[PDB]
Subunit: 34 residues, 6 copies
Amino acid sequence: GYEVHHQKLVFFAEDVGSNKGAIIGLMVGGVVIA
Amino acid sequence: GYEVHHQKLVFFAEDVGSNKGAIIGLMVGGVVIA
Amino acid sequence: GYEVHHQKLVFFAEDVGSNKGAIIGLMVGGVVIA
Amino acid sequence: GYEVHHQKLVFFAEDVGSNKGAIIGLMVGGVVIA
Amino acid sequence: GYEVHHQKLVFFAEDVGSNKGAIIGLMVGGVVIA
Amino acid sequence: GYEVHHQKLVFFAEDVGSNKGAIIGLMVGGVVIA
């Protein structure tokens, strides 16, 4: 038959330090003022 | 038949330190002032 | 039959430091003022 | 300064009649057997 | 300055009749068996 | 200054009738068995 396994989807895979703006993974519509 | 298993979806996979702005994973519509 | 496994999709694979603007992974529509 | 107004986000903008399956607007994770 | 207005994002703009499967607007992760 | 207005993003702009499979607008990760 079929077999689908172990897919993987990462947006940010390491550290996110000292952010002072906007960090978005997925954004559908909308405004970002940074 | 079929078999679907062990998919994985990560947005932030490591530390998030000293944030002073906006950190969003998924955002549908809406405004972000940073 | 078929077998699909171990695909991988990364957007940012390393550190994101001292951001002061806009960092987006996937953006469908919408405005970004940076 | 800045001014952001009158954005609009619609998922289904017209009639939804005689549904016999699954109609979802936004789905994060989860299984749908239809 | 800046002015952002009257954006618009539609997923389904007309009728959805006699559905017998799966109709999804936005789907992040997850399985759909139709 | 700047002015951004009246953008528009449509996924399905007309009727969707008698569906028996999977109709998705935006899909990030995940399996679809149809």
